[PDB]
Amino acid sequence: GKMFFVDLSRCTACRGCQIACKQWKNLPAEETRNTGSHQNPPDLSYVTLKTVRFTEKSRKGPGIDWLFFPEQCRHCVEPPCKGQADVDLEGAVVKDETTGAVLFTELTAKVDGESVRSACPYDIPRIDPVTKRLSKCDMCNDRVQNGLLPACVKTCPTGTMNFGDEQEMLALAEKRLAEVKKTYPGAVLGDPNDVRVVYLFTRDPKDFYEHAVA
Amino acid sequence: ELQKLQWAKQTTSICCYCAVGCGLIVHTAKDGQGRAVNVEGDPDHPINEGSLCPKGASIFQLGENDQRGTQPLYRAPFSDTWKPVTWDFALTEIAKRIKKTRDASFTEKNAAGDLVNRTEAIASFGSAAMDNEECWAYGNILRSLGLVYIEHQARIXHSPTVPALAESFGRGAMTNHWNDLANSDCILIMGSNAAENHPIAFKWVLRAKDKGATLIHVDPRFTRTSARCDVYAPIRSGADIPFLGGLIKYILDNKLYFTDYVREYTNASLIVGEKFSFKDGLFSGYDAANKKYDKSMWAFELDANGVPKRDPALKHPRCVINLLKKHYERYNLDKVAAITGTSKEQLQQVYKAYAATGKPDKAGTIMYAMGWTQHSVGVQNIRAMAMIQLLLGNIGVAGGGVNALRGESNVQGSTDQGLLAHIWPGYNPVPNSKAATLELYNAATPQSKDPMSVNWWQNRPKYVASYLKALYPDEEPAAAYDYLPRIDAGRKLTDYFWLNIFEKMDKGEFKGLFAWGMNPACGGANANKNRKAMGKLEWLVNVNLFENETSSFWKGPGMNPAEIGTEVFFLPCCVSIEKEGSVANSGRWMQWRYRGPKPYAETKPDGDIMLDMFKKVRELYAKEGGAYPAPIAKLNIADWEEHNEFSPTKVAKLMNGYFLKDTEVGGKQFKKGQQVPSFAFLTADGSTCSGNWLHAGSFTDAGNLMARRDKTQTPEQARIGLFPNWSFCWPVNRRILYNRASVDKTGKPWNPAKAVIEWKDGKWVGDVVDGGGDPGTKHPFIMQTHGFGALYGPGREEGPFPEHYEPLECPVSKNPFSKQLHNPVAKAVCDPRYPFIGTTYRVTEHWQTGLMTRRCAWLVEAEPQIFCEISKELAKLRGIGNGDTVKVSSLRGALEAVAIVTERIRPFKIEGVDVHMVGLPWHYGWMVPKNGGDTANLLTPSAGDPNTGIPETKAFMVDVRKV
Numbered sequence A: 001g002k003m004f005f006v007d008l009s010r011c012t013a014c015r016g017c018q019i020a021c022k023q024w025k026n027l028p029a030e031e032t033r034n035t036g037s038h039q040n041p042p043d044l045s046y047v048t049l050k051t052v053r054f055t056e057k058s059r060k061g062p063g064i065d066w067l068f069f070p071e072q073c074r075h076c077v078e079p080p081c082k083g084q085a086d087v088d089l090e091g092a093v094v095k096d097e098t099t100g101a102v103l104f105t106e107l108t109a110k111v112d113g114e115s116v117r118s119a120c121p122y123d124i125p126r127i128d129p130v131t132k133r134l135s136k137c138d139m140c141n142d143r144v145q146n147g148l149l150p151a152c153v154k155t156c157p158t159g160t161m162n163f164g165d166e167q168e169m170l171a172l173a174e175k176r177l178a179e180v181k182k183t184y185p186g187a188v189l190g191d192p193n194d195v196r197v198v199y200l201f202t203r204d205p206k207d208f209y210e211h212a213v214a
Numbered sequence B: 001e002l003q004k005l006q007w008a009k010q011t012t013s014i015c016c017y018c019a020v021g022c023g024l025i026v027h028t029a030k031d032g033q034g035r036a037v038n039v040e041g042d043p044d045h046p047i048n049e050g051s052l053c054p055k056g057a058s059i060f061q062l063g064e065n066d067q068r069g070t071q072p073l074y075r076a077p078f079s080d081t082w083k084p085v086t087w088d089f090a091l092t093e094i095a096k097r098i099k100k101t102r103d104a105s106f107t108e109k110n111a112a113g114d115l116v117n118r119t120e121a122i123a124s125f126g127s128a129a130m131d132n133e134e135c136w137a138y139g140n141i142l143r144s145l146g147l148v149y150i151e152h153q154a155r156i157x158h159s160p161t162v163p164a165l166a167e168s169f170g171r172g173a174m175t176n177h178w179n180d181l182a183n184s185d186c187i188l189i190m191g192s193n194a195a196e197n198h199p200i201a202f203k204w205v206l207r208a209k210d211k212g213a214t215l216i217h218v219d220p221r222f223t224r225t226s227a228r229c230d231v232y233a234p235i236r237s238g239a240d241i242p243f244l245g246g247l248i249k250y251i252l253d254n255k256l257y258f259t260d261y262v263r264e265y266t267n268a269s270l271i272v273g274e275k276f277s278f279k280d281g282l283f284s285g286y287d288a289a290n291k292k293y294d295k296s297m298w299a300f301e302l303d304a305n306g307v308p309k310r311d312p313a314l315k316h317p318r319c320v321i322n323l324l325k326k327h328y329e330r331y332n333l334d335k336v337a338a339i340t341g342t343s344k345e346q347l348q349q350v351y352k353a354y355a356a357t358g359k360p361d362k363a364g365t366i367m368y369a370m371g372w373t374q375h376s377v378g379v380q381n382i383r384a385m386a387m388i389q390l391l392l393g394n395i396g397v398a399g400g401g402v403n404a405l406r407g408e409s410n411v412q413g414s415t416d417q418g419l420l421a422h423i424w425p426g427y428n429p430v431p432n433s434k435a436a437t438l439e440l441y442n443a444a445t446p447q448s449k450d451p452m453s454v455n456w457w458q459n460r461p462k463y464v465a466s467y468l469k470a471l472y473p474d475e476e477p478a479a480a481y482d483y484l485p486r487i488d489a490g491r492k493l494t495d496y497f498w499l500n501i502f503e504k505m506d507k508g509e510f511k512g513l514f515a516w517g518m519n520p521a522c523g524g525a526n527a528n529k530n531r532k533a534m535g536k537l538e539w540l541v542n543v544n545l546f547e548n549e550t551s552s553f554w555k556g557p558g559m560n561p562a563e564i565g566t567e568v569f570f571l572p573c574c575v576s577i578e579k580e581g582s583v584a585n586s587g588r589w590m591q592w593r594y595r596g597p598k599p600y601a602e603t604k605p606d607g608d609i610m611l612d613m614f615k616k617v618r619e620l621y622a623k624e625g626g627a628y629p630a631p632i633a634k635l636n637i638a639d640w641e642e643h644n645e646f647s648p649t650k651v652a653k654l655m656n657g658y659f660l661k662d663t664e665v666g667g668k669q670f671k672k673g674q675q676v677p678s679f680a681f682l683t684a685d686g687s688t689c690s691g692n693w694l695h696a697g698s699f700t701d702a703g704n705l706m707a708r709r710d711k712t713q714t715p716e717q718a719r720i721g722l723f724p725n726w727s728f729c730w731p732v733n734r735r736i737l738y739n740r741a742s743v744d745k746t747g748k749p750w751n752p753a754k755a756v757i758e759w760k761d762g763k764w765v766g767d768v769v770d771g772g773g774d775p776g777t778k779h780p781f782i783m784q785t786h787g788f789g790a791l792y793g794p795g796r797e798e799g800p801f802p803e804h805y806e807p808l809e810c811p812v813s814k815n816p817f818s819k820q821l822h823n824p825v826a827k828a829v830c831d832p833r834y835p836f837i838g839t840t841y842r843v844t845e846h847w848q849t850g851l852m853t854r855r856c857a858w859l860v861e862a863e864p865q866i867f868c869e870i871s872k873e874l875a876k877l878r879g880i881g882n883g884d885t886v887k888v889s890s891l892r893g894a895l896e897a898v899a900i901v902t903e904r905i906r907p908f909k910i911e912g913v914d915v916h917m918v919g920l921p922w923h924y925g926w927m928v929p930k931n932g933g934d935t936a937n938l939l940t941p942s943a944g945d946p947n948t949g950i951p952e953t954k955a956f957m958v959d960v961r962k963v
């Protein structure tokens, strides 16, 4: 299938990915406030499939380690979200066989929304207060099937976002992990064997976000 | 297929925001007829390869916006409401206001009795947001109407660069281009936040890093740029010259300069006169009365023929290089470390990493924008960078250059078209009252007796003639010269500039203002003064995308519409993707873009609004007569339009220029009506026209070169990413300037692995060689009189060498380098109620005053409110918690913002005192959004200086209080 390699050691937190995701699906803007952070929206929601999380970490010397985490569904090889939802209706959550995309269908209005979120070890699924539909990164499955890159991957100017065949993206992740380690010696690949969104973290993934790894 | 795109026509465009110039693909419904359905990146564009920052990515929400102006609006004097009107009405009643104001205020001769043929009753602002054809046509419309107060964005961010690099290299432009950043071995980012403010630039910066380059960020703040650099060196506000002075001294001490490059291609060897000296912060020839220098005291010792004397041995103690060694002796690590606030360990690290690029086969580049040069010594900051780059042999080479990042998508082009008080198009000066004839104008052109010095500005007469022949083709240039207005040689050049326009306006010395594609009510420093000053205009014309804080100043905060008698015409223009034309990016890439969707509602391109408006004035004079009608009547606007509308294509071809008769020139035959191949084939005799000599070669008989989308490259071109067949750059597709400096005297590159040009059997190969002639026969800086890169630059107001004068007033009382504290050729209260150094800057997600991006839900989503960034130190002092509402106040005004408490801001040690810096975005305004906040320019001073006329928006005194 297909795979994302997210080299977080190249992220400028431009938030091109965040805007590009919404422009492609024509999703509506949330009502946001500044509460002493650049991060907005604060969390994922029904209308936000991806938000960039900002974390400041102290370091001796001048400046900080500014951690940027563009969060999306991991599109897991064995999705906990599916297994959970298939106890109510086998179809609400399906895996595309060709891409590997874990897709929530319209039948998620029937399943228990809060229960499919809890099953998720990355806390990705979000309910519509009205519809009761689960929504998240759909992998831009539309575009991938038609030979186009995902909107977030195309828009990314740093080479943080990569997408391709899982053989090629594994190869790039191993190669890049080795090179990045030379500057950030505690750099690790997020759940390489479980997920199709392989994040390269520069340090302890929990610093980027509490649910950055399973 | 994708249902969204399936039935839409696909056109290409260029991003309408920053000067990177990223490519878009636009999808428009009804096979081009209807609205846009999708805007994303052009995957074939060589600069961005389909990547877009959030501003570019959200251009769909900019274009297809329900809040966009739909038709011309009218605010009657003392009214509190807009009345919708027709175009026919707006443009006529505007044309009446112009003609009236002109007829009444138009003086043909100044007090001295010298011909001026101008009005000082009308001022224009803008704009770098218009197409290059609109900017040119607009500049010439205003100048036919006899305006002299013609300014835009460039005055603030761009104006310091042009004199600094012009003095140093011969031109004011960014020396290289964006793709070239990838070829650098060390990238020094100082007075730039490029990762946020030129985000696609960071594609190439990180490919520099991929191939072993060190990335250095020198900034008072830890930014998103800092997050991705190998070295972050915190510098306190205004300590840049100390920092660069210490680097110059470090390079000379450790002998890291490129010896051959310096000896051959800089002015290192030139002998300065005995009249030149420097003592305790002052150069020789200082006039304490007029606070000016006698610059003739800084002149070179001239040989028999009048050429500067050279000592190739570099021994003579009045050799530039030896005077340079003497001057920067004072800038030792301990002194520089102390004042910059950068540790001696980290200064050594940055100097070591960067000065290593003095290697012939190592290239170091410097990226700067606006942040650091908002004071009277901005020019000397850039001069210091030019001189470092000359010592290390980094000018002319791949991964080298001075990368003066331009701001707006077409601020390069808007400046090239002369939308500033002091320049016509092609940077030919606006003539003064004492340039009474065209011959006298052409007499002021300096000459050189050096037979190895090309001295290309000698051709000025050909360009000025060709330009007058583009405006007035039925007249002899000598005769045409009398039509266009002139400035008083008496007055100060800064008296016609941005800051003085507000000062004059506030004294009611202006009847009418054009605010054309700008938001001065938020963009102007000291907004309260400016908003009031606008109320003292009779009539105001705002051409823009949305209603805004300028158009609607009369119903602003603490304004009573009733009492305000300003007649306001708001004209809604179409967005970039709704029109055709060219914009020049930072790299001088003149890129063509196409209409996708039809203009939204009754909105028009700017070219149609200005051409129609002028056509109404033209016929108004044909009917009534009035003040000196020749310039308005005789102006060639027939070459601007096809099918009764503005023609980007035709204007572009006029700007390029064509032969007005059968002409023999450069030993070649040309027939009447043929497009000029290049500015090499322009003439002073009136045979040729060309609206902009820099554009000569952009639109030839071969076609529109700006519109080429061709990625064909020879190996040598592809190895450094020249992309010479992708669009076109001035001059004549020279992608890297001063490239003659990238080879030795035999024509071999210093770094063959990253060659720019190379002499291969009879021809220069790779880039277009910047100056014709065989290797070793010509000095590489062709626009320089003497032909050399200027280490010593005696044309500068402040002195021939950069010297630290404190741009801060309040927290400083001791210059540790001289007895001269402040700039001796340039009053601040420093009320102790305002003890913090306030500063303004940008976030990635917003644009300028936010007039555009505050109208875009997704950009507001990410950055919804004006904030105030403070250290953890100042937070605990003022008892301010992260996210708490705060009051930020100065002598000029006050506002509220959300506190961001971060370690990314630190206190500065200034003369053994913790001075706290507070950071504000100037992206906000009262118009939108709800709870967005207002402009940070409520706080800023409108005090500039008599040389640059730039206000200090980067270091101004404020207090910040919890609420």
Ligand SMILES: Nc1nc2c(c(=O)[nH]1)N[C@H]1C(S)=C(S)[C@@H](COP(=O)(O)OP(=O)(O)OC[C@H]3O[C@@H](n4cnc5c(=O)[nH]c(N)nc54)[C@H](O)[C@@H]3O)O[C@H]1N2
Binding pocket: B018, B153, B157, B190, B191, B192, B193, B194, B196, B197, B198, B218, B219, B220, B221, B223, B235, B236, B237, B238, B239, B240, B368, B369, B370, B371, B372, B406, B407, B408, B839, B840, B841, B842, B843, B844, B845, B846, B847, B848, B849, B954
């Ligand atoms: N996102 C975004 N990008 C933009 C724009 C925008 O509005 N938003 N506008 C465009 C325009 S018109 C322009 S002119 C450019 C300007 O681009 P920049 O010049 O990068 O803009 P700023 O962020 O205002 O200032 C840059 C940096 O200067 C630093 N600085 C402040 N004082 C000093 C000092 O004394 N020394 C040094 N070395 N640095 C200092 C600030 O901390 C800041 O990080 O950006 C362009 N691009």
Ligand SMILES: Nc1nc2c(c(=O)[nH]1)N[C@H]1C(S)=C(S)[C@@H](COP(=O)(O)OP(=O)(O)OC[C@H]3O[C@@H](n4cnc5c(=O)[nH]c(N)nc54)[C@H](O)[C@@H]3O)O[C@H]1N2
Binding pocket: B016, B127, B129, B130, B131, B153, B154, B156, B157, B370, B407, B408, B516, B517, B518, B519, B520, B522, B523, B524, B525, B543, B544, B545, B546, B573, B574, B575, B576, B606, B840, B841, B847, B848, B849, B850, B851, B852, B922, B936, B937, B940, B953
């Ligand atoms: N405190 C502080 N003040 C600053 C700065 C700072 O850093 N700090 N930066 C300064 C600098 S460098 C600059 S560039 C100025 C900029 O100040 P302005 O140029 O006044 O800024 P805006 O008007 O917000 O942005 C450009 C305008 O272009 C308009 N526009 C876009 N497309 C088109 C088009 O096709 N046609 C027309 N006619 N208009 C169009 C938009 O509607 C918008 O109003 O602000 C300056 N002010």
Ligand code: SF4
Binding pocket: A010, A011, A012, A013, A014, A015, A016, A017, A018, A052, A068, A070, A152, A155, A156, A157, A158, A159, A160, A161
């Ligand atoms: S992943 Fe790419 S597009 Fe997204 S914030 Fe990081 S650099 Fe920007």
Ligand code: SF4
Binding pocket: A020, A021, A022, A024, A049, A050, A072, A136, A137, A138, A139, A140, A150, A151, A152, A153
């Ligand atoms: S892959 Fe598509 S749906 Fe998922 S975050 Fe990126 S743009 Fe959004």
Ligand code: SF4
Binding pocket: A073, A074, A075, A076, A079, A080, A081, A082, A102, A119, A120, A121, A122, A123, A124, A125, A136
């Ligand atoms: S990340 Fe969560 S929502 Fe996405 S596939 Fe895995 S379990 Fe399901």
Ligand code: SF4
Binding pocket: B015, B016, B017, B018, B019, B020, B021, B022, B048, B051, B052, B053, B054, B055, B056, B057, B198, B199, B200, B201
């Ligand atoms: S704002 Fe500048 S960097 Fe961002 S997409 Fe537009 S041109 Fe590219």
Ligand SMILES: [S]
Binding pocket: B128, B153, B154, B157, B406, B407, B408, B411
């Ligand atoms: S600009």
Ligand SMILES: [W+6]
Binding pocket: B153, B154, B156, B157, B158, B370, B407, B408
């Ligand atoms: W600017």
